[PDB]
Design a binder for this molecule. Structure first.
Ligand SMILES: OC[C@H]1O[C@@H](O)[C@H](O)[C@@H](O)[C@@H]1O
Ligand SMILES: OC[C@H]1O[C@@H](O)[C@H](O)[C@@H](O)[C@@H]1O
Ligand SMILES: OC[C@H]1O[C@@H](O)[C@H](O)[C@@H](O)[C@@H]1O
Ligand SMILES: [K+]
Ligand SMILES: [K+]
Ligand SMILES: [K+]
Ligand SMILES: [K+]
Ligand SMILES: [Zn+2]
Ligand SMILES: [Zn+2]
Ligand SMILES: [Zn+2]
Ligand SMILES: [Zn+2]
Lengths: 371, 368, 370, 371
């Protein structure tokens, strides 16, 4: 019982990153009144409360929890140009700033970003060397929107690509699949590997949400990357049925065709049923099913090698239950935690008429993407 | 001076639901919140009023001093036992006498004031002191059953206000159009067997009450045909809402011929609300308010009273509320909604909208 | 009866000024963790809750509440150099900043600072023209630490000096007294008039608090201003007895000798018993006493002309009861408001031994200053 | 580098205790408006931020940090009557309550109180068995105002007395000294041992603060406890000089005469210079001095056996720097932490004239209490 083979990678400094004073994500000034209680959208508590519940549940006693270690600037330069890293560190040493679109940070945010990327790097490395069978990295700030030279949407470094390239330099790995179930499009991961065949990048996201107006079915890669990028925009208001169907008919077959040597999941929990930053209806049970599917795929394709890296998630109240369910599934253990909304959110799921239409939309995309 | 009344009182912001994480009670697995506590926080309503003041619009609004309803007003809807137990709990430490309707010490008096804002707004529209009105009621009312508070609602604000107007003025027909994203089960129950109020609810399918749709609940006895439930799919945007108003709500009002239109205006269908999955934004509420004003112009001499219900985004509710009041008053301000472009880009695609329109068209045929 | 002759000057935009993300007033960074919940020290709620209680009490029905109007850049230039105003406006048009010592502000803070100063200007003007007998201006951001060229300690413009100089240009008023009972030293007001006899500046403050380490008894002005500045540093831990003694034996006699044509109170409420930014023991009853004393002085010396301008106060929970008590005293009415801490904060007051010693310290200052 | 002999005892559940909605400590109601941001006075963050800074500082890598274990009902009954324990458990199983004066708690507060007391019990036990040389227990809820029959002032169980009596039953310890430097009077500790000679209870506190109006110099015990209780009320506005003089002239000589076999410090951090709940002027350097004096006393009198148990402290911004200073002193190490208020809070200290008068008051008390 005792110790599982699942690693959980976290460091206190990830909770010290601050985006500044916003009302939700709206900058103050003009017509947006400063907030009185919670400021910001990516608040530390939207990630800390997940860790706190994990500790209260007792699960941490059964997890491998290594000390966090930051990436180096050299690790960053495998993805980002030296000019971006210089200006980022320069602003961080002053009073912070925002070098992209909706990517604010405070004094010292550079070092925290290095630690966050280091949690992902260590999780992927420890899975590859067999120190653990699978892993969850509680990275904050997130990574999947960060382009090589432009931070975006709360993401300051390209966490997953940095971790993959660091692993390639130290281990060599023939093919990697990144499955992004954060509710927003993983435009950063897509851009980092768009012209390459050695990473299959898959994103399931709310149609048109972030980047705003973007769907992306027709963006399949270019050059050697043609056919190695898969975008699955789902309608707002999709629930577990739609997500499970997209995984069954698109994600899983795409992974079987590609035969990766490692599966990385970009795990945003912002598709949850009460998140302010999207319109989806997933709940804790949904994340159990999706995690189980990814574990099954990793078991069949790459000896169970599955690394899960946190991205978004904006409900302080409900994100902890979804994260708890993921880690429980990775570790193969249940706890005494009771999700208080388990039945309510099941009753909120769309009816059969809506689910049938959403499946038809998914089937149409599966024909376009897999044939 | 505009001819639009805005009814608000400071005490409505002093009602508190207690410590919850969102709406989850704290306990073994729900950690107490660190920043904002609760879901119906005072700021989800005060920030609307604050923006109205910053915009200058309050200088052109009629803003009477709030006056609470009396126990006699409450007893037209609620049994004396409920009102007694409510007052007794409020005089102690508060409590929760229903399902998800917590309140603190003194919450009874605040609920009387909240209902009084709705009573005054409706009365002032009926007597013509103002052409239309917005009542910033908190706590909300549209989930409150005659003997059971529910879903943040402690008294049946709109029904108390209608029955108070009837007791002085005698009104033959009133229509209540509820665009709060949750089903107005309280309004529905107060008038379910009556023809003198047409109750219409547009709500997210299955949301609150959880799993409830309600198309088939069309009234009973003398009220048969006088209740209309319009469940819309989660993820519906402006196109779907406007179509449901064009094809169901407005035709239903035309047939019924109300002497007064009351809108139960929750702002929780907004695109970033935590408590629903809809995609309305400030421009959507301008369109819907314009449609209700045009209906009131055609049917009842512009008599339109708008009573606040839900809305849970502290950041974004103010811009939606501002847009409604600007539309009621017929004046624009310098306020620019910073999310106008983004929330337009978020709207559903044509394929989704076409399917949602088919679903609305099917209900329109059934609902006559 | 019906309406009073007391004005209350407030504008919604004053609550929209933000100092940014700080833990209390500490900047976030390597060792100061970002706060969860309340960020900053000068939070909007430390002033808005005062107004909210005033509304709940019903007192606003009987107060004159004119619409707020800002001061102009021209009004500011009577005190501040154009270079400061230009750099302040420049930073405010971008993303905010901090041009001094512990004076952060956000985008648009310049226009809000103009409105805050405008509340003080209008309050003083309306008292002078007789529109109201007395007034309270809920200014935020505060003003009494702002030097002519350097903002400091949450103060971005010199509210009271700008208001006084505007009243001079408009009405030619000759002698004004400023009595500053904010718990911190009014170094800005002192600096603005240090060489001038047409304003008597008096500050009662916690010894060494803000500016840190400053006491100031011997700084009594210069030139024509010699004898027209009075600093009364009181020990940390002083309560109502000590404050009342300093007012009876120093403040009131100084006003009698100066013969002002207007009394302005710089009213910070941060000497209250639970404030985080000072160590004093005043409570709502204390502010009734001090306000009555200032009203008595104004009644004797300048026909009741008394304008009260808000400065500091950092207890969201308790500042409202102190502000309410001041405004009730100014209007000569009582309300149904019950201060829940009256019994406890009276029990917290220092014992006789300490009060005796504090009185001796006050007596020594009085012998020097008078 | 390597491990210190200092224990730090904390459990996640102590941060889940909630006092409910109060503005500061004022109950909400007709004239106290509900708070917007921070609710309550004893907020979880007033203790968690101390732990968070300890982790950031790297000091935790060199501290012994055992898993928290709660006390049992048997342990509580050594101090509290069965009727109180029964009623406390009953209210906790429902929806919480307040069984005393200013001691609210929420559902499940009973189990959390048992854990909080357990942190103190284990700290004292491990100091006594030699598992660590000294220890800090981050107890929350606090204990030192709790009377045997009546909770008070945020304290639900008598943490320190429960811990001492548990140590007596298991180890037979003969004499213990409790030195309470929380800014409020330790009326709970005083009551628990008032007629006993086997605990010397010393409290340094702001005169008249809490319980309100209480000074207490003349309350020196009864029966076998005569001369074994020492109250040192200091004036509001006292700073480091006054506190240090009180320790040099009263606390340290009292410990030398009593010859304890263990020293327990009831460590509230609410004498700090920005605390809302008192009027004192201590800062992080002051707590280094006071902790060093207690360590020197323990070194001379009881083989270094010193257990420090958290009580109050209500500045979220500043309490962490004071707690960090104490633990660094116990462990005998420095870190990279920079207290940002060192220069300002030194400038705030009282002038010579006040310090001389406060010293005279202290001298008069030493003449009554020790001679
Ligand atoms: O359909 C059942 C119906 O029963 C009636 O008694 C309630 O008042 C209605 O609101 C409800 O919908
Ligand atoms: O007066 C304003 C000043 O008050 C002092 O007590 C605080 O330490 C400073 O941070 C603040 O700026
Ligand atoms: O404070 C502890 C003691 O205080 C004394 O005044 C009481 O008489 C004692 O019974 C009590 O235990
Ligand atoms: K995605
Ligand atoms: K509805
Ligand atoms: K002063
Ligand atoms: K003490
Ligand atoms: Zn996301
Ligand atoms: Zn609603
Ligand atoms: Zn001050
Ligand atoms: Zn204390």
């Amino acid at each position: 019982g005792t110790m599982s083979n699942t690693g959980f990678y976290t460091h206190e400094s990830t909770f010290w990153h601050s985006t500044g004073v916003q009302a939700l994500y709206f900058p103050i000034g003009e017509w947006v009144q400063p907030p009185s209680g919670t400021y910001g959208a990516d608040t530390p508590e939207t990630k800390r409360r997940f860790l706190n519940l994990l500790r209260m549940s007792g699960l941490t006693d059964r997890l491998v929890m290594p000390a966090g270690e930051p990436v180096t600037v050299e690790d960053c330069l495998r993805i980002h140009p030296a000019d971006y890293i210089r200006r980022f560190k320069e602003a961080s040493d002053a009073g912070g700033g925002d070098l992209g679109m909706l990517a604010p940070f405070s004094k010292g945010g550079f070092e925290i970003a290095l630690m966050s990327a280091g949690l992902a790097r260590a999780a992927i490395d420890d899975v590859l060397t067999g120190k653990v069978r699978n892993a969850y990295a509680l990275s904050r700030p997130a990574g999947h929107h960060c382009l090589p030279d432009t931070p975006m949407g709360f993401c300051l470094l390209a966490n997953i690509p940095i971790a993959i390239e660091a692993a390639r330099a130290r281990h060599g790995i023939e093919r990697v699949a990144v499955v992004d179930w954060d509710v927003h499009h993983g435009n950063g991961t897509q851009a980092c590997y768009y012209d390459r065949s050695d990473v299959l990048t898959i994103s399931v996201h709310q149609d048109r949400c972030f980047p705003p107006g973007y769907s992306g079915v027709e963006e399949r890669g270019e050059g050697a990357g043609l056919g190695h990028n898969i975008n699955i925009p789902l309608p707002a208001g999709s629930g577990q049925d739609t997500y499970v169907h997209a995984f069954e008919t698109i994600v899983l077959p795409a992974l079987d065709r590609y035969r990766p040597d490692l599966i990385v999941v970009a795990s945003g929990l912002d598709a949850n049923a009460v998140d302010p930053l999207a319109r989806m209806l997933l709940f804790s049970e949904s994340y159990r099913v999706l995690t189980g599917m990814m574990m099954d795929a990793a078991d069949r394709l790459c000896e169970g090698r599955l690394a899960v890296v946190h991205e978004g998630g904006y409900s302080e109240a409900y994100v902890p239950f979804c994260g708890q369910a993921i880690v429980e599934t990775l570790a193969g253990v249940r706890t005494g935690v009771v999700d208080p909304e388990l039945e309510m959110f099941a009753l909120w799921q769309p009816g059969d008429r809506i689910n049938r239409f959403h499946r038809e939309l998914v089937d149409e995309m599966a024909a376009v993407l897999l044939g």
